[PDB]
């Protein structure tokens, strides 16, 4: 009497994700359920990693040298408390990715998404 | 819609699909469950994991050269430090003599 | 990033499995209720739908989830493949229920 | 066809349970796969 | 194909050692050549003077 999406979201609290946040990761399922699109979870994960890299770069070298894991989850709790606001998704939704050119070799020329031409 | 297509409005002789043979019986449940579409989300995010593994593997080795270049620099710096001190000493000593 | 995408799929995978066992349970209770109420046949006490959840093969690094289905007839403890009998009435009835 | 006899003796061992080719490298790539 | 991935990871491995080996060899050879020549010239000039 409980739907599969509700059933799966009932678990996300149970597992402690190592670095990427839990509730936004579960929300990444919601777009695939509703819009029936797969690509946003990729945009979601690379946006998450991009958001944490530039947050970490300003952080002082002495404490990257000793005990870096405490700061990344310190930034995680920030990420969940910004997630409830839901203000940054509108800027994300505007951007789109170009189609991969025919004959592109991800092994030799690298992945198409990594190329700057993929973003329009 | 999967139930609509498979179960509810069954085709005439297909009326016995509960008694179609095991592999056909299996092709029919997998449709009804709406399971094949969430097998597709799993396999897409699995490719996310394989490509993530590819990116870190190459970046693994860079740190060794990075740290070696970092560590030799301070030795070079202290070398120039003693060099400058000796330069000043010689400049003073020649005029003293 | 690589380990946590992994526990992420483990939660997605345990969700499709919990879903599968509960529906087997829902279908088994309704079918048993219907068949036990209608005793016209007198040849089969109960029928079940035996979905094989162990049919899933273990890939080198992946779940490769797939469930194999085959409907069986139960006479006491014994359970038979239900295929090969000539009781067309039983076949049509079981399909219907 | 003389070198084929010697190579037939050696063989790989099974991958350990819980092995992660993504983390530890692929199992056959490790030297311990051959006794 | 996974072995082609193995190729991919070996590709970056080669190029880092490339530049180090080449630059080290070139710089050391040039340094010994010029310094030894200068030492010989200096000693000869010292004696002539």
Swiss-Prot record, chain A:
Function of the protein: Core component of the MRN complex, which plays a central role in double-strand break (DSB) repair, DNA recombination, maintenance of telomere integrity and meiosis. The MRN complex is involved in the repair of DNA double-strand breaks (DSBs) via homologous recombination (HR), an error-free mechanism which primarily occurs during S and G2 phases. The complex (1) mediates the end resection of damaged DNA, which generates proper single-stranded DNA, a key initial steps in HR, and is (2) required for the recruitment of other repair factors and efficient activation of ATM and ATR upon DNA damage.
Location(s), subcellular: Nucleus; Chromosome, Telomere; Chromosome
Name the record gives this protein: Double-strand break repair protein MRE11
Organism: Chaetomium thermophilum (strain DSM 1495 / CBS 144.50 / IMI 039719)
Family: Belongs to the MRE11/RAD32 family.
Domain of life: Eukaryota
Coiled-coil stretches: none
Subunit structure and binding partners: Component of the MRN complex composed of two heterodimers RAD50 and MRE11 associated with a single NBS1.
Swiss-Prot record, chain C:
Cellular compartment(s): Nucleus; Chromosome
Highest taxon of the lineage: Eukaryota
Known function: Component of the MRN complex, which plays a central role in double-strand break (DSB) repair, DNA recombination, maintenance of telomere integrity and meiosis. The MRN complex is involved in the repair of DNA double-strand breaks (DSBs) via homologous recombination (HR), an error-free mechanism which primarily occurs during S and G2 phases. The complex (1) mediates the end resection of damaged DNA, which generates proper single-stranded DNA, a key initial steps in HR, and is (2) required for the recruitment of other repair factors and efficient activation of ATM and ATR upon DNA damage.
Family in the record: Belongs to the SMC family. RAD50 subfamily.
Subunit structure: Component of the MRN complex composed of two heterodimers RAD50 and MRE11 associated with a single NBS1.
Domain characteristics, as noted in the entry: The zinc-hook, which separates the large intramolecular coiled coil regions, contains 2 Cys residues that coordinate one molecule of zinc with the help of the 2 Cys residues of the zinc-hook of another RAD50 molecule, thereby forming a V-shaped homodimer. The two heads of the homodimer, which constitute the ATP-binding domain, interact with the MRE11 homodimer.
Protein name: DNA repair protein RAD50
Source species of the chain: Chaetomium thermophilum (strain DSM 1495 / CBS 144.50 / IMI 039719)
Curated annotation (Swiss-Prot), chain D:
Subcellular compartments: Nucleus; Chromosome, Telomere; Chromosome
Taxonomy, superkingdom: Eukaryota
Assembly notes: Component of the MRN complex composed of two heterodimers RAD50 and MRE11 associated with a single NBS1.
Family: Belongs to the MRE11/RAD32 family.
Physiological role: Core component of the MRN complex, which plays a central role in double-strand break (DSB) repair, DNA recombination, maintenance of telomere integrity and meiosis. The MRN complex is involved in the repair of DNA double-strand breaks (DSBs) via homologous recombination (HR), an error-free mechanism which primarily occurs during S and G2 phases. The complex (1) mediates the end resection of damaged DNA, which generates proper single-stranded DNA, a key initial steps in HR, and is (2) required for the recruitment of other repair factors and efficient activation of ATM and ATR upon DNA damage.
Record protein name field: Double-strand break repair protein MRE11
């Amino acid at each position: 009497s409980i739907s599969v999406d509700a059933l799966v979201q009932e678990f996300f609290a149970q597992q402690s994700l190592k670095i990427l946040p839990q509730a936004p990761f579960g929300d990444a399922v919601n777009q695939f359920v509703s819009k029936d699109d797969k690509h946003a979870v990729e945009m979601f994960v690379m946006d998450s990693l991009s958001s944490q890299v530039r947050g970490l770069l300003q952080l002082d070298d002495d404490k990257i040298n000793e005990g870096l894991d405490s700061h990344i989850e310190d930034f995680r709790k920030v990420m969940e408390k910004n997630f409830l606001s839901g203000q940054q998704k509108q800027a994300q939704r505007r951007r789109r990715f170009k189609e991969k050119p025919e004959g592109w070799d991800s092994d030799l020329n690298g992945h198409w998404t990594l190329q700057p031409e993929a973003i329009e | 819609p999967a139930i609509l297509d498979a179960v509810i409005f069954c085709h005439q002789d297909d009326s016995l699909w509960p008694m179609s043979e095991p592999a056909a019986l299996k092709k029919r449940f997998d449709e009804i469950f709406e399971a094949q579409k969430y097998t597709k989300v799993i396999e897409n995010i699995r490719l996310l994991k394989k490509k993530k593994g590819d990116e870190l593997k190459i970046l693994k080795e860079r740190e060794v050269q990075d740290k070696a270049n970092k560590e030799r620099a301070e030795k070079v710096d202290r070398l120039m430090a003693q060099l400058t001190r000796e330069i000043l000493e010689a400049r003073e000593k020649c005029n003293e003599l | 990033a690589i380990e946590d995408l992994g526990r992420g799929m483990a939660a997605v995978d345990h969700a499709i499995m919990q879903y599968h066992s509960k529906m087997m349970e829902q279908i088994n209770r309704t079918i048993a209720e219907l068949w036990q109420s209608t005793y016209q046949g007198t040849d089969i006490d109960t029928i079940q739908i035996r979905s094989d959840v162990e049919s899933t093969t273990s890939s080198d690094s992946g779940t490769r989830r797939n469930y194999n289905y085959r409907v069986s007839m139960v006479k006491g403890d014994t359970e038979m493949d239900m295929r090969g009998r000539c009781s067309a009435g039983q076949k049509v009835l079981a399909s219907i229920i």
